[PDB]
Each structure stands twice: as C-alpha cells, then as structure tokens.
C-alpha cells in the first residue's frame, strides 16, 4: 500500500548532470517528507537530504549541498533529485525513502544504480553452458548460460521465460580487466528432465536494449 | 625575543574524512594550511648561563592551528584552548602525562604560569607529575575523554586542531627527521587521531610546556634541568580547496592547493596533477571565505507558546490545563535564552538540539506550584504533588520549565485560588487528570459526603503570602511533553537564514539559486513580489532578500577569465597568466580581489606587464623575433619555453 | 562528524541462537536510533526505531535495547531468512549517519559442495576467447578454495571467483570460478581441470575434461 518506484539505472559521462525520479503512492505526498540516501557498493549508505513537498523546502548536508538539489512535484507525487558534476566517486546506488519527519525511514524504494564512466554500454555476449555428458549420479544435472560483456551493471536473467524458479543460481557479475562485466547463471535440474524438457535461458540488457534467449542442451 | 618566520613545508594535509578511497584523485574543501606559508618559529625558551626565557604566546585559535614540534625529549605537554582562559568561560585542557592523556572540559581558572608540574623522585628515578599549576579551578565540567599518550615517544611531531559546529577534531602523525631547524620538504599525511564533541566557543590558543623540579623552585636558578631545547612551529589554517591523490593503499601521496599559484589552479580545474602544454581556464583562483549564502524567508507561523506562558490566569495543579500544539514552527532556544526561567531541565533530549527535532504532537501543560515542589515534576520523582496532582512517565521526552511569580500570583491576604490535591485514593498515572471533589475517606467510617475526624477534603490550597519566601512562592510551571509517533509530524524547528553578511565573494544560493559572487548593496529595485530579483540572464546581478526587505547586488570573483599557459609538468615549471579582455591597468583591478587573498600580492610575479589585445599577459617575455607558434595564445604571437 | 562503531563487525550463528549487535556513538543520543536490516541487492528495511519500539510488520523475535551511547539489537531466535547486513543509525537530527555494517551469517551443518566442470561452448571458441568455469553448489561453510590446473600444472590470475549470497532456505553458499584464456591456450592444452578444496570435503576433489570430447 506504500509503493516507491525509481527510474532505471543510468549511465552518464563524468562531469555531467543527472536527474533521478522517485514515485510515491498510497499516502498523501505533502504530509510526509521524502528523502534521498546514497550507498556506495560494499559500504554503508549515507543520508543525503530531505524535501517536504507542500512548501518546496529542501535541507541537505554541505557535502552534497552543491551536488544534490531536491525538487518535489506535488501534482504527480514525483520528486526529482538533480546531481551535477558527476564523478566516478559519485557513481553508486541511490534510494528514495518516505520520512514522517523524524529522519527514520519505514519504506524504501527499490533503488537506482548510478554508473559514471567514459565508455558506453556494450551488448551482451551469451554462451550457453552445456551439461557434461555424465551418468549424473543422484539424478542431478547442472546447466547454465554465460554472459560475457556488460558495461552497465543491470542484468536480466530468466529461465524458460522465467517459468523455472527452483534451484536457480545467478552469480553476481564480476568486473574484468577490460572493465566489461561477465555474468554466469545456472540452475539444477533432474537428469531425466534434460532430454524431456527444453531449457531456455532468457537474458536482457536494458541499457543496450538487447533481449536474447538461448537454448541449452548437452553437446552431441 | 622577537618572533621568527620559517617556510612552511607541504606537510599539514590531513584526511578530510574517514571514508576510504583507492587510486582516486578526490577533491575536497576544508580548512587547511596553505603551501609554502610562513610558519611562526617560536623559539620558546633559550638557554646558553641557565637564562630562563619563559614564553607562552597566547595565539588566536582562529579556524585551525597547525602545530609542529622537534623536541626530541618531548618537553611540550598537550595544548590549551579557551575563549578567555579563566573560570569565566569554558576551556579545554589537554595534558599528556605518561600514564594517560587527559582531555577534560572544565571552566579552569588558569594561573599566570600555565605549565605542567613534574618533580624528579630520587627513590624511583622517575619524572612523575608533581601537581597541575596550569589551572586553579574545575567548574561545570562537561566532557572527559581518556586515552593512551600519543605524543609520548629526532622525530617530527605534527598536529592539526579544528573547531567546527561544536565538534573538536585532532589529527596526528610522527616522522623521524635529521634536519636541525629546516622543516623537511616531504608530504606527510596527518591521519585522524581523536574527535571530540566539546561544543564550546574557542577563540585563542595557548601551548603548554612542562616545568621540571628545577623550574618548580621559585628561584630562577635551576636544580637539574634546562629548557633551552624548547622549540616548535605554529601555522594558521584557512578555508582551502584541495586536490588530494589517493594511491592503491589509500594513502594521500600528494596534494595541490587551488590557491597556491596559477599552475596549481590549472591542476585543480583539470582534476589532474599533470597537465599538458597549452592554454587552460581556471575557476578556483582563490578560495571562498565565510559561508555560502542560502536563503529561507523569516518564519511566520509561530507556535502560540507565549499565550500559554503569558496567559493572565493559570489553573491550579490538580486541575492542570493542557493545550495541544501542532502545524506550526516553534523556537525553544529563545525560551532557553531567557534568565527569567528559574528552572530549565530537559530529559531525553538536549536543549541545544531542540530546534533540530520534529514532533507530530506537542502538549504544553501549565499550573502553579510552590518553589520547593518543582523538583517532583521531574520524571521518576516521588512526592505528594507527583502522586496526587500530576505525574510524568519515567520515559518522558521533553523539558520542564519554571519561574517564580510571587509578584503576580500573590496578594496581601494571600492567594487561596491555587490548590493542590492533598489526598487521593491512589497514586496518579502519568498524564492523568483527576478533578473529583469526593471527600477522602481515610477511615473506615462511611461519612456519606460529610466532613469528619477520619474524613478529609482531598483538596488543599496554598496561602501564598508574599512574605512566605522562595520555596513557598508560587512558581508558574510549564511542562513541555513531546509525543513521538509513527505519523507525519507537524511541529518542526525554525530554519536559520544565517543572518546577513556583506562584501564576501561566496556562493549565493537564495532558496537554491546556486550562484557565486560578492554581497553588495543594490540601489536598483527589481520586482518586489519576487523573492529574488530576476535578471534577463539566469545569473542576476542583484538578488532580492527573502529574509529582510532589500535587494543586494552580486559580483563574481574573477571578472577576468584566468587562462593559464604552461608546458607539461614534465617539461617545465614556467607559467603564463592571461586575463582575457583585461587591460594591464585593469590587471591591478584583478590584483585587488587577488590580494584580498594572501600571497597573491607576491603572485602574478611582480606584475611585469606585456599587453595583448586578447588580454594583458604576465609571467613571460614578449618574443620580438618572429617564430612559429608554440602555444596558441592569440593575436598571432606565441611564446615558448627557453633558458 | 558522528562516529558509528559496531561490534562485532562480523558474526555467525546457527538457527534458533541468540545474537546481539552493539552500536556505539561518539556523542550521547538519548533514544533516537533506528535499526535496519539489509540484504544484498535489496533496499534496507526498518526494524526498530527509538529503543524498544518495533517497526510495523516486524517479527516479534526482533528486539531493541540500550540507552545513550550503548545500543543493543537482540535477536532471541535466529531464522534462515534473518541473514543479511544490520546497520545502526541515529535519528537525533541532521545529519543522520548509518553504521559501518554488521555481517550476519546463519550457521548450519557442514555440507560438501556438488562440483561440476563446464567445458566452454564451441560458440565462444568461435569468438576467439576461451572461458572455462567449474561450479560449487550448495556448500557450507562459506570458505572454499578452488585450484585451476592446466595440463596438470597450477595456474593463477586467469580465474575470477564469485560467490552468491547465503541461501534463504538451503542456508548454503554457491561458488563459481571462471578461468579466462585465449583460444590458442585452449588448443595448446589437451586436459583442463579445477581442484576443489573445501572443509566439508574429506579430500580434495577434482573434475576434469578433455578438449573436443576426448
Ligand atoms: C613571509 O614573510 C616574508 C617577510 O616579508 C615575506 O617576504 C614573504 O612573502 C612571506 N611569505 C608568506 C608565504 O607569507
Ligand atoms: C511573554 O512576553 C511576550 C509577550 O508578547 C513574548 O515574548 C512571549 O509571549 C512571552 N515571552 C517569552 C520569552 O516567551
Ligand atoms: C519578515 O520578513 C518580511 C518580508 O521580508 C518583513 O516585511 C518583516 O518585517 C520581517 N519580520 C521580521 C521580524 O524580521
Ligand atoms: C584598454 O586600454 C585601451 C587603450 O588605452 C582603451 O582603448 C580601452 O578602452 C581600454 N579598455 C578595454 C576594455 O579595452
């Protein structure tokens, strides 16, 4: 009944300016403060500031005073945070959270990852991971797909149009030497289930806007 | 002994944040000691003959005091910070005795000779402390922190002290040195050491030097110790913009002051230590003093506290009045900043941060109780008033405010209108109002509403004769109870518009205009209903004041475009400064704002003049002989590096 | 500014045990602190604000305690879904500060990894680059070491290791190690294998395969 949605992850060149949109529902936008929190990956998040829509007032700390400007539109209950002079240090995940004015946050949006780098989005390269031709003791079979190159962080992994949800494991993408992020996801299936059912790995990369579905089956 | 000066090394850089960065050129702004500054080399004590030279320069603390010591024996012991260095004001005492470092915040009444007393003990052969002659008093002690000695154990000792928003920070570092008097030209980062929420005003600094049993004697003759080795360094931190460099391990390898010189300004604007040959524009040609200007209009919807405070009539404690307060802005420091209030105690929150918090509902309850009874109102207390007239939760959040009113609530015959419930069947719960007039049946006899030997009227009233005295005098006591609920809050503190300042080229952000410039009076009158006067361009020369009723002109700091020409940092260190569209006579016009910044009088070199239509050029010689262009300065003439 | 200290930084316990996380602040904040639970890739969720006040829709297992400088978050009974990172944050006014982060790991019985070798797809060989990965499935404890042996010779620097978050129910981690090589290096070596060393494993186990289904 309190839903907070944010725009998709954004790739921006360093030094530019970016805007992030947060949407609120199920409660009066004006009566409750809406804030912003920025979290470095592998590191504790940090408070940014608050905005109170009915008067447009915004208070923020000096560290992000120059970086962040809070704007709240009462019409659509959508408050936009504007960041400028983007640096690699700025690139992180940002959250919008409802505040009842006490600076403690009961609800949180899904968050948006902000990426700052010179290079652009690279299309995924997908390689299916064929199960090895084995006796497969215990009725246990292993299969997956390999995504070779992601410049943006976001990954979309689906199994047979997302139908299969048991034994699904998607390892986090790992930064490579070239900087491209490679990700591999796998799922465990019954051995008899191999030839009987067709297994499809469905991958999407929204920044590249490329949707690829690959069929996987043991070679020969 | 006259003061002396020495060249500051690049050392003095401290970590601005506890955040870790690796292989990142991160730019930060804070108080810093500028590079190549003048450091007042206090030769504190000189002994050749055993001539005592007792010197304790009480320097102004200012923004940040950079400290450096070369004492091999570590004679210096801590530092002293205080506004007035007496019991009149709060002072900070730091003592570095070997057992532990003492950080105690008290209103010490310091003596004329503020030294550390240590006597040599023959039996133990130890330099253990004798007594603290540095001060004489310990009044209203607030904050104490104890740790191991950090300056205790040919090694340079450096420290940086900063006092910001009532928060005290210390940075420290030690490095061996073989230079007798010259500060080593090495980059030594100063890691954070200890942070203190002292929250007092500090204006002037004084260093502390320990006097041994030799100097403890009243006579000028020394028993067995001489302080000739005493010597240290002092420098003043100023607001500066820095371009720190983090390595893979995160250590601050090197940094450049954006205000050090034009090449460092080019480094700052290019966000890299190494710049190539060419022409580049800079912006941080000096720092912004004071505070950036952000505006909010003065408050209008005040919470009606004064009505409760200044109501003509107050009710008795038993029938205590209650008012709900919401949907307004309230100032409590103003109530705190009033000597008319005899008792001002807060529980569960600090009075200082009162304007910082928001509450959905604030309930104010007021009544009249005599002087000695004010103690019971505090949470968790016991007594007749607490039990049968008014009680507070043990987890109460808010403040209790009281003041004498014998002048108003007493008369010649004494006021009997004010009443206190003397008797009741059971102790009151918190926030419980009892108005029953039923006779208290202390005995077993059912009186049926008739006064008797064991039947008493539960209510009792004061006499309140004016000559009864304080402790019996009426005290109009108001209780501020704050309700903290999971609901959108209404009551919030005021927003400060930082008063007003003039003639400082700083950032103006009137309700978020995000501009930069100097504050000057504007004779021109823009459209009044606008909070800020809007110019045809986005940047407005004059900005109207939401706080006051005025419009103020603004003006950027660099009216000339600071275009710096220099070869690669590998190539040469020569510089060429071009003020675009600025006459060589207007170069002094720039030099005015530049010389407001220290050492830029020296910079622009001696202002050796060469004039071009693109702009006046300083720092190079015009090549009369025709040559191919080396850097496209403009107007078809270019200068090149040479011996 | 305000300093957050959390002890212990890392903690692990089994299901149904009692876990307490301590928070320390430089200044004295009277009762305005909030506890947040965080899982990898998720938004934080409010658990306890003030000191004793449980948040809405929070299991009764969670409990908050402490006053002033000392603030304790106590879990009377651990659950498999309770895994994640826990933060202590004051809300005594601007600016709110989050804690460093306390890692909580749900301890369970030692489980041997199900190891699988994955020969690279012929498509990637067509692409000109070779990536070989072998898999660790549903193993506890978290600690595990994989050794990539190329033609019965140890190698390093060509393999990247990634570990998923502890399973919500299975309570067991998964590990993937991807060896990166050129197609020429693939053609040079006939035999490829990774050796898996784990506490659950009685002895090191290796899975091997030969190029070209040999
Ligand atoms: C230090 O003082 C000397 C004395 O005149 C002066 O020439 C020099 O410019 C000063 N340097 C700094 C950095 O203040
Ligand atoms: C009572 O005095 C005046 C009345 O206008 C005003 O300051 C306020 O209402 C009260 N005083 C204080 C200090 O609150
Ligand atoms: C508040 O601001 C308005 C408009 O700027 C002004 O007319 C009024 O005098 C101000 N009041 C005070 C008390 O400063
Ligand atoms: C600069 O000096 C020249 C020569 O005296 C003069 O013509 C000009 O008006 C002055 N000002 C500017 C902005 O060029």
Residue numbers in the entry:
A (entry chain H): 1 to 9, 11 to 30, 35 to 59, 62 to 72, 74 to 110, 113 to 230
B (entry chain A): 24 to 71, 74 to 178, 187 to 676
C (entry chain L): 1 to 29, 36 to 57, 65 to 72, 74 to 80, 83 to 109, 114 to 234
Task: Copy the relevant paper text.
In contrast, HSW-2 showed binding to RBDs from all clades except SARS-CoV from clade 1a. Of the two HSW mAbs, HSW-1 showed no detectable competition, and HSW-2 competed with CR3022, a class 4 anti-RBD mAb. We next used cryo-EM to investigate HSW-2-spike interactions, observing two main populations of particles: unliganded intact spike trimers and a Fab-spike S1 domain protomer complex. From the latter, we obtained an EM reconstruction at 4.1 Å of HSW-2 Fab bound to the WA1 S1 domain using a crystal structure of an HSW-2 Fab-RBD complex to derive detailed interactions. HSW-2 used its six CDRs plus FWRH2, FWRL1, FWRL2, and FWRL3 to recognize the bottom of the RBD, consistent with its competition with CR3022 (class 4), and although their binding poses differed, the HSW-2 and CR3022 epitopes overlapped. S1 shedding resulting from mAb binding has been suggested as a possible neutralization mechanism for CR3022 and other class 4 anti-RBD mAbs;22,26,27 however, HSW-2 was largely non-neutralizing. To determine accessibility of the HSW-2 epitope in an intact spike trimer, we aligned the RBD portion of the HSW-2 Fab-RBD structure to RBDs from spike structures with all “up” or all “down” RBDs, finding steric clashes in both cases. The inability of the HSW-2 Fab to access either “up” or “down” RBDs in an intact spike trimer is consistent with the observation that HSW-2 showed weak or no neutralization activity despite binding almost all RBDs evaluated by ELISA. Although the HSW-2 class 4 epitope was buried in “down” RBD conformation and could be partially exposed in an “up” RBD conformation, structure alignments showed that HSW-2 cannot bind “up” or “down” RBDs in the context of a spike trimer. Corroborating this, the HSW-1-spike structure showed only one bound Fab per trimer compared with three bound Fabs per trimer in the structures of more potently neutralizing mAbs, and the HSW-2 Fab epitope was incompatible with binding to its RBD epitope on intact spike trimer, resulting in a trimer dissociation.
